[PDB]
Each structure stands twice: as C-alpha cells, then as structure tokens.
Swiss-Prot record:
Gene Ontology BP term (one): cell wall macromolecule catabolic process
InterPro entries on file: Endolysin_T4_type, Glyco_hydro_24, Lysozyme-like_dom_sf, Lysozyme_dom_sf, Phage_lysozyme-like, T4-type_lysozyme
Activity vs pH: Optimum pH is 7.3.
Reactions accelerated catalytically: Hydrolysis of (1->4)-beta-linkages between N-acetylmuramic acid and N-acetyl-D-glucosamine residues in a peptidoglycan and between N-acetyl-D-glucosamine residues in chitodextrins
Protein name: Endolysin
Organism, scientific name: Enterobacteria phage T4 (Bacteriophage T4)
Gene that produces this protein: E
Annotated effect of mutating E11N: Loss of 84% of enzymatic activity
Residues spanning the signal sequence: none
Top class in the EC scheme: hydrolase
Amino acid sequence: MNIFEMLRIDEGLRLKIYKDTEGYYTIGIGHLLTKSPSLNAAKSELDKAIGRNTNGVITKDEAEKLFNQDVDAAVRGILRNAKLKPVYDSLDAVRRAALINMVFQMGETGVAGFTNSLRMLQQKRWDEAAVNLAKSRWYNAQTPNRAKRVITTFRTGTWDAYK
C-alpha cells in the first residue's frame, strides 16, 4: 500500500461530475472543481484542467493525471508549510501517508490548524494524538469513517485500517 492506493480507497473514482459530502463539484479521484454552486462553473473549471471540451465527463486516464498532480501538490504544500514540514520529517513512511491524506482532503491550511494534534504527533504520543484528532468536525460530522481510517493509521503506523 502507498498514498495512491490509500487515497484511491478513500476517495473512489468517478468519471462524471459529482457532488462531494458538502455538495461541491468534484470529479475523478477527489478532484475538487469548484466550491461554486454552478455546474457551468464546474464544467468550465474542468475543461480548463483537462484542456478540452469535456461536457463534464472524463476518461480514466484523465482522472489519473489529475490525481498525480493533486498528490504532488499536497506533498509540496506540506514541504512548504513551516508548521507541517517538521511534523512530516519526524514521521515514519506510513504515518506521513496519513498526513498527506488529510492535506489532500482539507488543504495545508486546514491541516496546519490542528496545532494540538500536530504537536502530539511530533512528540510521538499516538494515543493522545488520536483522541485529539477525533474531536473534529472532520471526524464528528464531515467524514467519520474515513477520518477513523486515517486516525488509525496515525495510531498504529500500519495500514491495518486499509485491509
């Protein structure tokens, strides 16, 4: 398992325009198109990303290129974040993969705001960190089950949540 399989697992794949948990236009493997209520806007945003007239639908390979780009930016976002980077440096390979999962899901900015948990990860207090992570809208309301998976990864440093 690696970050690709992991997010592939958490996000799925859809070749047509869709609405994520918060009613936002998304496509492929979690590609957020636009916070904008307009399907048109979502379409125009899409055609731009892909570089063609999609009519709102893409190919598998097209999903896959957006995904590579997205995993890449995540990682880079982390590396540029003053707040995120040192956490990241301290983590093992599995655990960074969860860190990257949350960044992909709620941005660097959203993530860099879980200060508390971040220190606790930094300091290797897995259990405390999981508990702290759990007190979130993320966990509580947003995406419970996926948050539990990611939460568990951070705890165990295993992919057990993934099989």
